[PDB]
Amino acid sequence: MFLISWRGYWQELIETLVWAHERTPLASLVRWKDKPVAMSIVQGRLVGLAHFTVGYVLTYAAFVIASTAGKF
Amino acid sequence: SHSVKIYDTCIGCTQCVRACPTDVLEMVPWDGCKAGQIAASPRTEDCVGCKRCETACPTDFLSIRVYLSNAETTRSMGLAY
Amino acid sequence: GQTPIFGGSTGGLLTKAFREEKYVITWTSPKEQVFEMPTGGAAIMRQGPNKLELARKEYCIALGGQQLRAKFRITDYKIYRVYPNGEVQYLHPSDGVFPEKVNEGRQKVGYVDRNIGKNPDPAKLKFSGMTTYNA
Amino acid sequence: TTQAALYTHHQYIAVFLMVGAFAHAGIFWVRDYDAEQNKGNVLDRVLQHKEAIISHLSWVSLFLGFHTLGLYVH
Amino acid sequence: VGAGLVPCSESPEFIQRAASARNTTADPNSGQKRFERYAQELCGPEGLPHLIVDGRLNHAGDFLIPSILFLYIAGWIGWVGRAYLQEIKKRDNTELREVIIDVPTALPLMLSGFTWPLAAVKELLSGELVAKDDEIPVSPR
Amino acid sequence: QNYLLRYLSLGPVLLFAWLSFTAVLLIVFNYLYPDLL
Amino acid sequence: SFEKWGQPGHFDRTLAKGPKTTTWIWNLHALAHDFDTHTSDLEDISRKIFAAHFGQLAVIFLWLSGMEFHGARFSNYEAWLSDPIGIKPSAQVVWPIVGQDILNADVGGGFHGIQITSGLFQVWRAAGFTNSFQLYVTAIGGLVAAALMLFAGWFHYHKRAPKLEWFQNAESMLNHHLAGLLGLGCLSWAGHQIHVALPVNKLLDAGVAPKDIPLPHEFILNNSLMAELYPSFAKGLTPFWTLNWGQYADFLTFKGGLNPVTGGLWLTDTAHHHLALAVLFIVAGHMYRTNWGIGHSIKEILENHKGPFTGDGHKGLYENMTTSWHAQLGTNLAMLGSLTIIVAHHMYAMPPYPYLATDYATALSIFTHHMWIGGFLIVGGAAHATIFMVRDYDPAVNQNNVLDRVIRHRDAIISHLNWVCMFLGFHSFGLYIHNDTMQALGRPQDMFSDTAIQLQPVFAQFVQNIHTLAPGSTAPNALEPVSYAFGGGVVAVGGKIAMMPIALGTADFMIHHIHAFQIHVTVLILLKGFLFARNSRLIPDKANLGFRFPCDGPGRGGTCQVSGWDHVFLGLFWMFNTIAIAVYHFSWKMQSDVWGTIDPDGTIAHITGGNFAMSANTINGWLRDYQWAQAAQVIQSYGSALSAYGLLFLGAHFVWAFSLMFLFSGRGYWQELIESIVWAHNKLKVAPTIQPRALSIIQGRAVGVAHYLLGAIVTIWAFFEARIISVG
Amino acid sequence: PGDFLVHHAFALGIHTTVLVLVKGALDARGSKLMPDKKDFGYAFPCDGPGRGGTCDISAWDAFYLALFWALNTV
Amino acid sequence: VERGSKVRILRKESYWFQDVGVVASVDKSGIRYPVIVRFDKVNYAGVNTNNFAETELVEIE
Ligand SMILES: CC1=C(C/C=C(\C)CCC[C@H](C)CCC[C@H](C)CCCC(C)C)C(=O)c2ccccc2C1=O
Ligand code: SF4
Ligand code: SF4
């Protein structure tokens, strides 16, 4: 998910989603610590790679130790 | 905002000044070639990073470049909110 | 004080565009015809004055460039930045019709007329924070 | 189970440990490098013929891949 | 031919497979015949033959002459392709004909690849195969 | 007329032609004596 | 007259000059049909569309006649005629050379070949087809008609081409088509049915010597055998002259159910069906105004329907529906797609051909095929809607209309939409994984099926119920319920189920809800691209710049993928997910509690054993209890005579990974590698004059998504094809 | 025979891995169609769509690819 | 090196460095880049025509 989609789509909907808090009542009290925006490009690449590598690591380890301790 | 970079290869067709929608260019008087007025960036603070300008530069190894900095703000990021 | 005939929308001015900045544009249109606005809308203008309020420095310049002079040939429009205090800035028009190359002598601040073959270097320019220009 | 886990553990540790070396070699090439101080020494003579290196490397990769896959599909 | 590999002639499991060896094609002798053709090599416990590559005349021809055949045909095709390319450029209709093949000229070049190896050797000795490091102007860096 | 080849020689149609020629070529030797190993 | 083909770029002025680089090749296969991008004229466009339609029809006729011909000379039909049970139809006999010799699909009677699954013989069990020579003549007729209408297209383009006012008479269009085309064809087919179909169907009850059974000429004027059955069918008694129709109760009846002697329904109902439809939409299609000064002025109807919330109603919509073409294209595509998928969702409960529910191989093949086409083209309908938005519109004729009234308040719509999608999404899936965790956590009482925490879709149950007892009161002149999945008796034949009532317990809930979930997000993506097509809150030049362009530079951070067809990219990914899990669900249920074998007690011993109530509630179960069964033979399903077809499922994974390679990578890397190889080739004097250049990023994205889809769908069809072969 | 096969596979794997790595390394300075990058830095540079696009040119774009090519090898 | 002569390039950053082009028009005016050369190999959008200072050109033949 992080790898394929890119930062030209995950910003249009953040606009309209900022539009909400401004105009609903009983929740417009709170405001922003800091104005939120979409991620960055390099950071997106990095997080995608991190997710991929962590996903790759775990399953194989589980498989190998479980198999070795279950078959001898 | 970001930084702009000018060179000597400006032939002077002035397609970049008609392409930048951000008012960051002007042809200041020159003497060297038949141009007599070479493009430059007086108003960098409104740079956007669209870099539609050098795509309008026909010169071999297009005469303008933009060094895309790191000191962005609400202006350089371009938000209506 | 003239504003075009429109039925209302949902993408106009926001919590920033009256706490930080305002944008306005106005010209002289001796006719009335249908036009399109970048926030979406097909409406009609009126004779003479045509005042419009907006929030971005892109909708205005888009109107000025493509709509007015390239279609309607109108060329007498002011575009004005506004501060939070209500005071105004006059960036452009600065050359009449924004030709962007004609003048009898021009401003002079900063110059770099040098090729790239001799470029700044990491190990030579160090222990400071200057940029790619000072040789 | 113990020795097996240890073996794959250590090899996994090893693999991208080397990638760290190559990456830091790459970043050295931009930050820490002076031209005239090494004019004509062995490093520059490497850079002068990098082309044939990468070309022949692509060559051997293509060869081995093609033929191993062909034998497999055989 | 060691490594504990039995001859395919006397490997029992080899003939065991050969008995009901599924005759592939439309001829009943297809299977059996091929198994008979597989007595020269030497089998193993898997019952199927391995190939030895040493120039050793036990299995020399079973790998050498196919290699040389491939070298023949690859040399021919590469040679005729390069020759055609060299020829096209002396027409000043370069990229017009790059997609439209000139058959009346493309034929004899193909037909004239008979003696590619030794002719190539000549172009090696004459030095008619390489251009000069700096004459070739393809800029690196 | 014989101008058809002027408009049949395109490359692509010639590609498939040559490839099918070579294919049936490879077939007949595999069709006539597929019994030499 | 052959001096003209080999002059490429005949339609474009730019790429007509010469192929500078390889790019010139690519665009050659890209702009060969959008001739709206060639001029501003329209009569030429319309003529091209006519000729292209004729060509498509020609290839249609060609392929259908050729498939017939294969069915006549290389298909075991006439042997499978006498026995449609103990014989499995086949075609495409294998050519006896090295490689394809063991693949002789022998289906009894020594007939080898390829065991097909497309159920054309089923049509050929209703059309009453005895000898293959008549079929030979049929193919000849099909191909000659193909050539005929192709010649007609040539003529109507090169000699006498139609004029321009010939386009926009949608009134006569609807009238002629609706009435003449549909009604006359349908009533003609019904006439064929009553004359030939049910007679030979009667004659297919006990082995009545098929070829010996007379030919239609023996019934054109020979009413004696026609007077054997149906005493009112002496001639007809022609009581229609007397307005009396009570005599015709013989054939033109209303049964409405399964006929356990045909493997399908009662054909008389279908005949009377077709009659009723014919006259009904004949009198319908006689509506609109034409050349006799009588009828609806349809451009005034839409003028009338306005009001307080409407604004000004449907004013000004015909300029859009006739001046532009992509509009019509998109809407008709969407409608056809929906129609097709309901067809798919339809013909597994009311089999309209002989031997359908008893034949457990063709069913899901037809089903999944049509279902895939449905979505696969409705997304294209939406895409053409968007292309209309970018190509055709008007600020003048679109004041305050029901169209313009949404493009002004799009943000609220899409925000509430996002809200709904988020809600449904986790409300369903997180609930699912919650139950997953509970089962893995020794807390089984926190499960959600009947044996645990409760939820029951009462609405479906009550609607099915009120459908069960329909006849008598709602349907007095009706004999059996419309189907037997709602209610009725378990209808069957042999030890083989035809239709039983379907049970909706707990697992139905989240399945239907995630269906709705994905449909919601799909609509979200597509409609988002639709509205935000011309102007975004940041990009006010979209329509001013195009709809097929990669990005707008690294301004505002990033802006890559801001066109619309990338929106439809993401959408097609999502619809892939939707339809894939949909077919998963359908196949698993209709093999778990609908299909199996039967005992003399009517004892339905289903294939799997009702696995949803057991495992279709947790994720780990979903992989275990579905693909364990869906593959446990494909590993070994090769290795003998009628097994040798080593399937390309092992092969499709490769294309899938090769696909995903194109997605994750840029292009500059490939460009530089290309330049290095060019350096080498130039050193050895073999430099190709036409300078190769790497693919454009949109081109690469397209080929990546194409290969992705191809691999996935190939994989899945291989899966269930072999799975049905293991039982059919 | 199998060991013959897989060992050649290892050869291939490390060959392409070092290929992409040395390509990125020796491009840490600049490319034929983008020589300036030496001053742009071991950083983002994207160089928007000059010729079909120039995404993934930033001197450790290669690092991602190399990481994949190492993971499958190991 | 005249109007219609094939010469190679000395400008380093040039896309056609060391590559040969034909001197289309020999200008010799006060501009720093008099010589107008034409090539056929394409850089960005085909700038096969360019100008140089003829103190940056060398003939071949
Ligand atoms: C999803 C996605 C986003 C959107 C991602 C965003 C907005 C970040 C997600 C928001 C945060 C990270 C969610 C986590 C919030 C936690 C629940 C709060 C933590 C507090 C607990 C520790 C208590 C991008 O910006 C993007 C950019 C470029 C390429 C791809 C993508 C991409 O795929
Ligand atoms: S940079 Fe380009 S547009 Fe600007 S003056 Fe130079 S040649 Fe003209
Ligand atoms: S991105 Fe380019 S066009 Fe826009 S302001 Fe900066 S230099 Fe000018």
Numbering used by the authors:
A (entry chain G): 665 to 736
B (entry chain H): 1 to 81
C (entry chain N): 7 to 141
D (entry chain G): 370 to 443
E (entry chain O): 24 to 164
F (entry chain Q): 8 to 44
G (entry chain E): 25 to 752
H (entry chain G): 517 to 590
Give the text the authors published on this PDB structure.
Photosystem I (PSI) is one of two photosystems involved in oxygenic photosynthesis. PSI of cyanobacteria exists in monomeric, trimeric, and tetrameric forms, in contrast to the strictly monomeric form of PSI in plants and algae. PSI includes the pair of associated chlorophylls that excite electron leaves, known as the special pair, P700, and between 96 and 112 antenna chlorophyll a (Chl a) molecules (Jordan et al., 2001; El-Mohsnawy et al., 2010) that function to increase the optical cross-section for excitation with a subsequent high-efficiency energy transfer to the special pair. Upon photoexcitation, photo-oxidized PSI transfers an electron from primary electron donor P700+ (a special pair of Chl a/a′ molecules) via its internal electron acceptors (A0, A1, FX, FA, and FB) to the terminal primarily ferredoxin (but also flavodoxin) under iron-deprived conditions.
